[PDB]
Design an enzyme around this catalytic site. Structure first.
Site, mmCIF file in Angstrom:
data_model
loop_
_atom_site.group_PDB
_atom_site.id
_atom_site.type_symbol
_atom_site.label_atom_id
_atom_site.label_comp_id
_atom_site.label_asym_id
_atom_site.label_seq_id
_atom_site.Cartn_x
_atom_site.Cartn_y
_atom_site.Cartn_z
ATOM 1 N N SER A 30 37.800 46.319 32.354
ATOM 2 C CA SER A 30 37.022 46.626 33.542
ATOM 3 C C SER A 30 37.929 47.072 34.671
ATOM 4 O O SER A 30 39.026 46.500 34.872
ATOM 5 C CB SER A 30 36.243 45.392 34.019
ATOM 6 O OG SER A 30 35.351 44.902 33.023
ATOM 7 N N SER A 41 39.394 43.087 27.339
ATOM 8 C CA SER A 41 38.376 42.611 28.277
ATOM 9 C C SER A 41 36.997 43.221 27.968
ATOM 10 O O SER A 41 36.495 43.062 26.841
ATOM 11 C CB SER A 41 38.845 42.953 29.698
ATOM 12 O OG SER A 41 38.261 42.096 30.658
ATOM 13 N N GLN A 42 36.362 43.885 28.938
ATOM 14 C CA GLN A 42 35.064 44.508 28.669
ATOM 15 C C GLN A 42 35.230 45.474 27.489
ATOM 16 O O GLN A 42 34.329 45.629 26.662
ATOM 17 C CB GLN A 42 34.540 45.269 29.884
ATOM 18 C CG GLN A 42 33.167 45.884 29.611
ATOM 19 C CD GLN A 42 32.567 46.622 30.797
ATOM 20 O OE1 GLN A 42 31.671 47.451 30.622
ATOM 21 N NE2 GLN A 42 33.002 46.284 32.008
ATOM 22 N N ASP A 58 42.804 31.696 29.587
ATOM 23 C CA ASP A 58 42.012 32.889 29.828
ATOM 24 C C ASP A 58 40.557 32.468 29.620
ATOM 25 O O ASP A 58 40.084 32.382 28.485
ATOM 26 C CB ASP A 58 42.388 34.029 28.877
ATOM 27 C CG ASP A 58 41.644 35.336 29.207
ATOM 28 O OD1 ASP A 58 40.747 35.310 30.080
ATOM 29 O OD2 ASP A 58 41.957 36.380 28.598
ATOM 30 N N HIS A 60 44.504 36.131 31.837
ATOM 31 C CA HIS A 60 43.743 37.318 31.429
ATOM 32 C C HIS A 60 44.540 38.592 31.652
ATOM 33 O O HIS A 60 44.260 39.618 31.037
ATOM 34 C CB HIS A 60 42.440 37.421 32.224
ATOM 35 C CG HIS A 60 41.492 38.452 31.699
ATOM 36 N ND1 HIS A 60 41.025 38.449 30.401
ATOM 37 C CD2 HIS A 60 40.914 39.525 32.301
ATOM 38 C CE1 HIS A 60 40.202 39.470 30.220
ATOM 39 N NE2 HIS A 60 40.120 40.140 31.359
#
EC number: 3.1.1.74
Length: 197
Positions: free
Chosen positions: A26, A104-105, A159, A172
């Site tokens: 993201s 991530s995303q 995370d 993260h």
């Protein structure tokens, strides 16, 4: 820099042996973000600059913070974009071995896309690496419809997105060393396992 469109730009008359499709996190820049470039240089070292095509998921994938809250951790438009890239890879280079990844995303996107992908094309994805997988807990560390042996999840202690939350904490942001070392080694190994040697 952080943008590679080797598949979209590639000539089908001179297909690479390996095609890597990657989805950034993201808010990240280009279509590769922070981790993609590190994976790419390692793959290029192993297969040669002409032996591998690097393709980031761009287009409709805006990598918006808000899309993390949608059902599968990303938007339907982004999933369509990635499915279209897998389809394009199969259409242009049917003999190429595919490999994928996401952060991530982007990890949620890679998982959703692979889940929905035509099984015949999914079988061609030798391995997939996921960093800070936002659906790690929900999917019990798996990519739906995809074997565990072709999956490699990198989820650090601390995370929170790997533990069912959407809170971004320092761990993260610590996947850089994984992207330049173990992640590409895993992908290279998986490519050799399916192609033989």
């Amino acid at each position: 820099r952080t943008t590679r469109d080797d598949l979209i730009n590639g000539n089908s008359a001179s297909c690479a042996d390996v095609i890597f499709i990657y989805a950034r996190g993201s808010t990240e820049t280009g279509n590769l973000g922070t981790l993609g470039p590190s994976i790419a240089s390692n793959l290029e070292s192993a297969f040669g600059k002409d032996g591998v095509w690097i393709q980031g998921v761009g287009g409709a994938y805006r990598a918006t913070l808000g899309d993390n809250a949608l059902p599968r951790g990303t938007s339907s438009a982004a999933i369509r974009e990635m499915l279209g890239l897998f389809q394009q890879a199969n259409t242009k280079c049917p003999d190429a071995t595919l490999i994928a990844g996401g952060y991530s995303q982007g990890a949620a996107l890679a998982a959703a896309s692979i889940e929905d992908l035509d099984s015949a094309i999914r079988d061609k994805i030798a391995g997939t690496v996921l960093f800070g997988y936002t659906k790690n807990l929900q999917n019990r560390g798996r990519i739906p419809n995809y074997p565990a042996d072709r999956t490699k999840v990198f989820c650090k202690t601390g995370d929170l997105v790997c533990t069912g939350s959407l809170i971004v904490a320092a761990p993260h942001l610590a996947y850089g060393p994984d992207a330049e070392g173990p992640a590409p080694e895993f992908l290279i190994e998986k490519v050799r396992a399916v192609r033989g040697s």
